[PDB]
């Protein structure tokens, strides 16, 4: 509810069936070997009765579903014991633009303001064989059944928590079918299921929706963590952005685990921009008025776990403790130009990566304008701006230090699974 909302894509056999062909051809090559995850960040999350702001353009689809709600810290939950970690279930709505591609993360399609209605948590034993219904303006519009999902609730909790710890109050959306129904301004969309209070939301022209949902500020880091893919010219028509779940974050001089039996885990030094004022539809020219200042991240990746579904996916990029980030923020006024700073990485004192923000493809103002054009940025949100060339493998015992000129120096130590236990 106020927890992180994860969700699974491609979990309904109808979509798997529909996409079977596409999944054998470029750019997928092969069907998903593993669950395809996404996140509905805090700007999306609304309760019953709250409006879904409609972006004009622009075709929008309801996505009635149900979400498991975590009742206690879930790390490596065993399938057979899942119910003990689940407080209950809640009706939800993965509101989305069309699912035309599953290759790149679907941020414009799924992370718009108000795009995740979620209702009341109900303490049921399971949601087996549950028909989830959608009504529009009070008429029946759609129905589907959780028996047609590939992974059930227990399996989803076990699969995600295997690498990403969930906290009490976090949720998992169980998935949606291929076929969806379209909503438009003026519609009232209602989700219903036996055993739950109906969830209802009106769809309103976004130009008519008021101030934007705000949140209490908490010490950094606390906010949506956006991250760029390929953003250094060093050696894309539009930026590749994906989100990282907050349990990936860890502080200075901590440890990060390298999984057993993989070939390649690499650091990624990055300049991180932190938002200081709520921002929507901001021009490049005013973007910097919304920046609080800068910090540093080490955006690790396990290259082995990469797949071609919402790439780079959560099993690579939202690993528990695989994103060291400094807790200090350097105010923008202490940094004349963020587009002229050196980044470096050292492993055991050997310089392995060096670059400059002069090589950013997409500038800080471009990125702020680009994201705020389709979603609300709030104070404490962070934008990891990418990394220059110079990646390499790091192994247990290694000390990896990333540094951005004038912003900070961030230390981390790799350990084995055996050591971290
Ligand atoms: Ca990165």
UniProtKB/Swiss-Prot annotation:
Q: In which pathway does it act?
A: Aromatic compound metabolism; 4-hydroxyphenylacetate degradation; pyruvate and succinate semialdehyde from 4-hydroxyphenylacetate: step 4/7; Aromatic compound metabolism; 4-hydroxyphenylacetate degradation; pyruvate and succinate semialdehyde from 4-hydroxyphenylacetate: step 5/7
What are the record keywords, sorted? Aromatic hydrocarbons catabolism, Calcium, Isomerase, Lyase, Magnesium, Metal-binding, Multifunctional enzyme, Repeat
What Enzyme Commission number(s) does the record list for this chain?
Answer: 5.3.3.10, 4.1.1.68
Q: Which Gene3D superfamilies match?
A: Fumarylacetoacetase-like, C-terminal domain
Q: Name one GO molecular function term.
A: metal ion binding
What residue ranges carry the coiled-coil annotation? none
Repeat (Approximate) residue spans along the chain = 1-202, 203-399
Subunit structure as annotated in this protein's UniProt entry: Monomer.
Task: Please state what the protein is called.
Answer: Homoprotocatechuate catabolism bifunctional isomerase/decarboxylase
Q: Which organism is it from?
A: Escherichia coli
Taxonomy of the source species: Bacteria, Pseudomonadati, Pseudomonadota, Gammaproteobacteria, Enterobacterales
Q: Which gene encodes it?
A: hpcE
């Amino acid at each position: 509810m106020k927890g992180t909302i994860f969700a699974v894509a491609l979990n309904h056999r109808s979509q798997l069936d529909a996409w079977q062909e596409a999944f054998q051809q470029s750019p997928y090559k092969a069907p998903p070997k593993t669950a395809v995850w996404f996140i509905k960040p805090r700007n999306t999350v609304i309760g019953c009765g709250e409006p879904i702001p409609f972006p004009q353009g622009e075709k929008v689809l309801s996505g009635a579903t149900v979400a498991l709600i975590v009742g206690k810290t879930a790390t490596k939950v065993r399938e057979e014991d899942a119910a003990e970690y689940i407080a209950g279930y809640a009706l939800a709505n993965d509101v989305s633009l069309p699912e035309e591609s599953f290759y790149r993360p679907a941020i414009k399609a799924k992370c718009r303001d108000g795009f995740c209605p979620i209702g009341e948590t109900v303490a049921l034993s399971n949601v087996d064989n549950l028909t989830i219904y959608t009504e529009i303006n009070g008429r029946p519009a759609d129905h589907w059944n959780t028996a047609d999902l590939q992974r059930n609730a227990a399996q989803l909790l076990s699969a995600l928590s295997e690498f990403a710890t969930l906290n009490p109050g976090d949720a998992i959306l169980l998935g949606t079918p291929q076929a969806r129904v379209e909503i438009q301004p003026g519609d009232r969309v209602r989700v219903l299921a036996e055993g739950f209070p109906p969830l209802e939301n009106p769809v309103v022209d976004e130009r008519e929706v008021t101030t934007r949902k705000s949140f209490p500020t908490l010490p950094h880091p606390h906010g949506t963590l956006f991250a760029l893919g390929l953003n250094y010219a060093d050696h894309p028509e539009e930026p590749l952005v994906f989100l990282k779940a907050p349990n990936t974050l860890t502080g200075d001089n901590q440890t990060s685990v390298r999984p057993n039996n993989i070939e390649y885990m690499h650091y990624e030094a990055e300049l991180v921009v932190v938002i200081g004022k709520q921002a929507r539809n901001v021009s490049e020219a005013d973007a910097m008025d919304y920046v609080a200042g800068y910090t540093v991240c080490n955006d690790y990746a396990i290259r082995d776990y990469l797949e071609n579904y919402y790439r780079p996916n959560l099993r690579v990029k939202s690993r528990d403790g695989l994103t060291p980030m400094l807790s200090t923020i350097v105010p923008k006024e202490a940094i004349p130009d963020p587009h002229n700073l050196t980044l470096r990485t050292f492993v055991n004192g050997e310089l392995r990566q060096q670059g400059t923000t002069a090589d950013l493809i997409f500038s800080v103002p471009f990125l702020i304008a680009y994201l705020s054009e389709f979603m609300t940025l709030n104070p404490g949100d962070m934008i990891a701006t990418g990394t220059p060339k110079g990646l390499s493998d790091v192994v247990p015992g290694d000390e990896v230090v990333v540094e951005v000129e004038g912003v900070g120096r961030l230390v981390n130590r790799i350990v084995s699974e055996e050591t971290a236990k």
